[model samples]
Target: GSKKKDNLLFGSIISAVDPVAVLAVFEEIHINELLHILVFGESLLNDAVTVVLYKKK
Candidate 1:
């Protein structure tokens, strides 16, 4: 609800069929699990994962 810079968004920017789902799945998965899952997943492939991190003071 808040678009203010107060909030920090740090993560990856991936190009895929379902960007929304990627974000959701990334949030749910831990950093350790990310590498393994990002590249390959059931019923999903041909997606690219980019490093796009953000932060707010």
Candidate 2:
């Protein structure tokens, strides 16, 4: 009825969903293996390069 009650209902429904159940495939293997390919193991390297370029500007 009220805005606060509406928000509570929406939040509860969202939290009830299970993350692992939604992505059950990752349970069989190391998640980092995919992360490595996605970023080419350069996660920190790219961030570091961005900071350097930002400073130079």
Candidate 3:
């Protein structure tokens, strides 16, 4: 597990950034379309959650 840091803004930014790189690999491997939805959904969800937490603090 990773330790928490006062870096929620960056965390929110990076969480959303993850899907672009993952999608690159997904396309290279010819992954399923639904998998794209899942990856992007999860990344976006994490981004929103992180942003909320950042703003809350």
Candidate 4:
């Protein structure tokens, strides 16, 4: 009910420049395909499993 909720509820430019961060990582080292799955594939498949279980029920 307090303004803390509002602060957490919305994002402005705080996350908009994330591409720059990823670019920074690219500069640091090579991110391999396994690393790609470790970081991103998990999230990408999260909804796949969730929806399958949801549809089963």
Task: Identify the candidate with maximal lDDT.
Answer: 3
> Relative to the unseen true structure, what is the Cα RMSD of model 4?
10.0
Q: Tell me, by TM-score, which candidate is best.
A: 3
Give one digit per residue, the lDDT tens place, for model 2 in 1-57: 556555755567654457765367456548666555447547777878987889657
Q: What root-mean-square deviation over C-alphas does model 3 reach? A: 12.7
Model 3: lowest-lDDT 10 consecutive positions? 25-34
User: Pairs clashing in candidate 1?
Assistant: none
* 6-53 per-residue lDDT for model 4 (tens digits): 453244444334768746656755656436735675676887888777
TM-score of model 4 (CA atoms): 0.29
Candidate 1 ranges beyond 4 A from true positions: 1-15, 38-57
Number of the candidate with higher lDDT, 1 or 2: 2
Candidate 1, number of clashes: 0
Q: Estimate each model's TM-score.
A: 0.33, 0.26, 0.36, 0.29
Q: Relative to the unseen true structure, what is the C-alpha lDDT of residue 47 in candidate 1, on a scale of 0 to 100?
A: 26
- lDDT rank order: 3, 2, 4, 1
In angstroms, the error of model 2 at 32 is 6.0
lDDT of 4 at 33: 46
